[model samples]
Target: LQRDVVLLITHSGDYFTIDRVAAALSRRNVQSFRLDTDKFPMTVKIQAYFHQSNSHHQIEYGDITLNTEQVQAVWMRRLWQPHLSPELAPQYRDACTKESLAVWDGFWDSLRHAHWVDDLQKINAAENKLYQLRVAAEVGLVIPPTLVTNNPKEAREFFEQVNGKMITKLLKPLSYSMEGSSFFMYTSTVKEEDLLDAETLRYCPMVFQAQIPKQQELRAVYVNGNLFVGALDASQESCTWQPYELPKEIIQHLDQFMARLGLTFGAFDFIVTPLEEYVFLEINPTGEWGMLERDLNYPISEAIADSLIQN
Candidate 1:
């Protein structure tokens, strides 16, 4: 509470971005704390009591004494769903009822109780695409024509209507890891025959969206009342900029756009054409731009640091 700024980050051990963020913040004299959800005690009563009364729940970042009432601003980087321990797994495996789920929900709701960044989080991850769609539509923003479908026949019919100029995206980001192998659901082009196969329908429902033909792409970061643009040279590939690889010119453009949004931070994915039109895509509220910052040399880290301090 003594400092002007406080940051709550997920402790991904060495795998998290806290170190880079801390280094970035240090340059500006901003302080932060990172906590690991996995480290929280597996026992209910013990964990609940610790969170309620412990002042120094020791973490590598230092004593993360979170006074929900004192912190001015917060960031919800990631709140992982704890895996059921093998011992109690069966006791609750088939009983994933509302009561049990509420306990899990309560753990998260408690974090949000302080009202830190409440409004921001609501607009960021609510999955209410309707709001985004309405705003974009009203502004005449270029967006992919999309349809969510579960029926294979319906998918095939929709693909044919686009003259095969379509890509399959996810209704929501879905991923799976089997024995350390990971599969990312990506925006990939789909053909008519592809939809005819029943096996393709075995998984969850998919989003079929008309593909925007373009030569370049953009990653616009919108932060507290500001937008940071990161333009990427993705002409060789039809997709948007890969987070691990982007160019500088793209970053500058997105920075400007983020400013226009009056947001502290946002990652805007866009499809740009050779003719120079930058097609806007959906903006992610709690997006991570560290990868783009490192790969593109954008000033996003400082921008985010400034945004946090300004709050």
Candidate 2:
């Protein structure tokens, strides 16, 4: 008989949320395999065979092996680019990485029937800021006026247009490693005089938005079609359950937004202005929620486990 299993795709290190989900799955007697793609071709090995005449295709990765017909569901939680070691031949590094990635692509293609928490393709499509903004407006969410530009003239004009109430951020998330140290970018408010250095922007485009004065910030996690909303004080970083009920219109808008994106999960950020307006920011397809779950005792881990086990 074929075994039923949930396949989790994430890296090997510190995943508290996945750890909690694994515990939950165990309580329900469901089997799960956590596959760290970064380990492939190093500590991990894979073999797959699918012939037309064969009854079933087989795949093996280290001690974990499963037939294509046995996978019950797939949770694409996190992904890492395959890395080549120092000993790897420089000339063959690129070729090896591509070949290794093909293994995962081919495996996913073969398992067409397995349910996915959020499919790979949809996640990539949803990562664009412009796309999210257009969709947010379409779904009745009030998006703050924003600009993306590389021209200094346009950048200066927009800064003036927002009446100097602006913040700046990178158009995409970026990180760099130098001498084994890492640097990450974060959102920052822009000073009016900062526009004098706008000449540097001629080589790089950036996202500038009118900063909304806030009463509270919301970090809402949408799982399947259910919403788990948490409010944090504007001055605080941790989350607490807000006593106010989410507005019916906003809830409906969120439901429609996720449905339109064909997303099974997303973490959305919003600013609740003092005027009682919900200003849409951006949504991360793979945002972290473990802190919220740990601090507020939210049932997010359970929800994810339940989603994985649901028929």
Candidate 3:
């Protein structure tokens, strides 16, 4: 007998979150089908068809097969790169990878009729930080003075405009990796001399902002309309997560902010000043909340399950 399915789009390394969501779905009598995207084109098989009368798709991986109609909801979790066969001719590998990822377009589009935790197109569009900061301000949230620029003179002027309290960061990952070694970028405070070596800034644009002092940090996970938030004091360095309640005004702002972005889920980051003023940061559409759930005993996975099934 076939059961209604909730498709989890993520990789094998996703760990406990997937298991927790699966268990929650099982409790609600909905089966979960996990797609470990890293295995794409090699072990994962996706097929769809079109006809004048009807259209359908099927996904086959391992011992299970998923028919389009059976998928009641899709959790747009993660998509890793395709893993090609090692023995393939070297020249064709790049083309095969491109073609394989291209085919995934229709694979997802075919299931557009079903419920999605978040619409992928909206997720991609919401990733724009400039647009996000604007929307956040429109909803009456406090944001730091921000600039996106490659021009060195403008950069220096903005740095001076903020009284040299500026910090700079990349809009997207500068370098996710350095060959086989791990490489990561963190926001850094700008020194006066740093601006002197600004010639290289022309090669890439960056986001410069007046830094906001923080007494604590907030991580809020919004699933549908429900928010599961936690506070952390990273200064302790060994951070502990605890439940945090947001002010009504801030909640309303976030409500409107998420609505404006057409998002049903987000993990929001914020800085809480010593005086309790809230400073808005970025909201990661596909953010992790497992730690919050584990530490605070929040029913986040079940909330996700409810959002998928009840909605």
lDDT preference between candidates 2 and 3, better one: 3
Q: What TM-score does model 3 achieve against the real structure?
A: 0.90
| Tens-place lDDT digits, model 2, residues 25-107 | 88999888887878876766666655786545555566777666777888888877676775868868888889888877877
lDDT (tens digit, per residue) of candidate 3 on 1-311: 34378899888678878889999999887888999887888888888888996887899988798897888888887776777867767868889888888878778887787788888888988877788899999999999899898888888888889888888777775454311110122565666545576756888887788878878778889888788999875531466888898887898889999899988888888888898999888888877788988999988998888888875
Sort order, TM-score high to low: 3, 2, 1
The numbered model that scores best in TM-score is 3
Task: Identify the runs in model 1 with alpha carbons over 4 angstroms from their true place.
Answer: 1-5, 14-16, 24-30, 42-64, 83-131, 151-157, 176-191, 194-203, 231-263
TM-score per prediction, in order, is 0.67, 0.86, 0.90
Cα lDDT, all candidates: 0.53, 0.76, 0.81
For model 1, where is the 10-residue window of minimal lDDT? 177-186
How many clashing pairs per prediction, in order? 27, 0, 0
State model 1's lDDT: 0.53
lDDT of 1 by residue, 1-311 (tens): 35344555453443534566566667877656655544343422212334455432122324344443344455555554444465666656545533444554444444553323324445453334445554555555556777776787788777788888877765555445311100122455657445468465646677677777767566666555454555554353553334433345544554544433434455566767676555665666555666566666666656656656565
> For model 2, what is the error of residue 275's alpha carbon versus the real structure, in angstroms, after optimal superposition?
1.2
Considering only N, C-alpha and C atoms within 3 Å, which residue pairs clash in candidate 3?
none
